[PDB]
């Protein structure tokens, strides 16, 4: 038999990879120097750089996954992989939307928003009841030095859970690029005023 | 961007009212299109959204089986049935651009003006 991927996604270009890096690296630099983030120092850990913090970043470009097969072993991936659409779609270029970042104690990411055409690529978890299918999607830009990349998804889909029901509170600030809410525990979403659009090729990672 | 909300009103608990929202300035029938809302006291929240086609829709639990968003691309316009309704549903409703998940609801220039819900006795 042949084995799958470790998993399947989306990877950036390198110039939308660099795009959106220095976007985040931005934001990071940005968000620790608020006054706001400072008072609250308390419930995430002189002052923090937050780059610093981050200090496992992803290596090369970055990506959005869709699933993780684990080369076969994962529930699931078989089916995934046999889908006419991921077959279709092997090796094709999308353009991604990202719509805000996040930070929390645990990992620094940002939000992916699919097309119809992209969500038929998203796999059929507790964490993301009641919310859209997708809602998951992201891209990991750092992660504090004990924590896994797989809990930047998680992280944001806590951050969905408080966004919809209003808990996201008013605006604490305006950053260049958007609107900045503080969502209690450590927690800091920036919505931004313009998506920004990636371009990736949709295929499967080995290792 | 233009998005004109109407149909708001009072109404008693379990009754009914259609929102309607009228939008120009962008491309209509290439966007995804959500409702929010804001009770008093409180930010705004999800209610729902609906794919370009119409194909796909949007609830939160709190309105799943009693609201249906629908919309008419030929007409620019986009509506909310509110059905059985409760005084918990009482708010200002906003129709955006864009998805719930894309957050644009958050930016003024992306929402309309607001229709005011009342139910009670």
């Known amino acids: 038999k042949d084995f799958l991927p470790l998993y399947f996604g989306w990877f950036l270009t390198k110039k939308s990879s660099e795009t959106l890096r220095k976007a985040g690296q931005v934001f990071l630099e940005e968000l620790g120097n608020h006054k706001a983030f400072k008072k609250e120092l308390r419930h995430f850990i002189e002052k923090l750089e937050l780059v610093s913090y981050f200090g496992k970043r992803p290596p090369g470009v970055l990506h959005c996954t869709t699933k993780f097969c684990d080369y076969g072993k994962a529930a699931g991936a078989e089916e995934y992989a046999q889908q006419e659409v991921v077959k279709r779609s092997y090796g094709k270029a999308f353009k991604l939307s990202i719509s805000a970042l996040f930070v929390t104690p645990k990992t620094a990411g940002a939000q992916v928003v699919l097309t119809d055409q992209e969500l038929q690529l998203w796999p059929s978890a507790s964490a993301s009841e009641g919310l859209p299918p997708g809602s998951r999607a992201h891209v990991t830009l750092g992660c504090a030095a004990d924590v896994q990349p797989v809990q930047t998804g998680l992280d944001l889909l806590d951050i969905l859970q408080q966004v919809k029901g209003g808990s996201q509170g008013e605006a604490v600030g305006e950053l260049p690029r958007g609107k900045l809410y503080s969502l209690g525990k450590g927690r800091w979403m920036l919505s931004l005023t313009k998506k920004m659009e990636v371009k990736a090729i949709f295929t499967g990672y080995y290792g | 961007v233009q998005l004109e909300e109407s149909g708001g009103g009072l109404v008693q608990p379990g009754g009914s009212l259609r929102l309607s929202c009228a939008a120009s300035?962008?491309?209509?029938?290439?966007?995804?299109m959500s409702w929010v809302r804001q009770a008093p006291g409180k930010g705004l929240e999800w209610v729902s959204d609906?794919?370009?086609?119409?194909?796909?829709?949007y609830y939160t639990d709190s309105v799943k089986g009693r609201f249906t968003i629908s919309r008419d691309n030929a007409k620019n316009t986009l509506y909310l049935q509110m059905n059985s309704l409760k005084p918990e549903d009482t708010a200002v409703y906003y129709c955006?651009?864009?998805?719930?998940?894309?957050?644009?609801?958050?930016?003024?220039?992306?929402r309309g003006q607001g229709t005011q819900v009342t139910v009670s006795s």
């Open positions: 300035g962008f491309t209509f029938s290439s966007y995804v």
């Open positions: 955006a651009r864009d998805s719930l998940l894309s957050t644009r609801y958050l930016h003024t220039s992306e």
């Open positions: 609906i794919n370009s086609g119409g194909s796909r829709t």
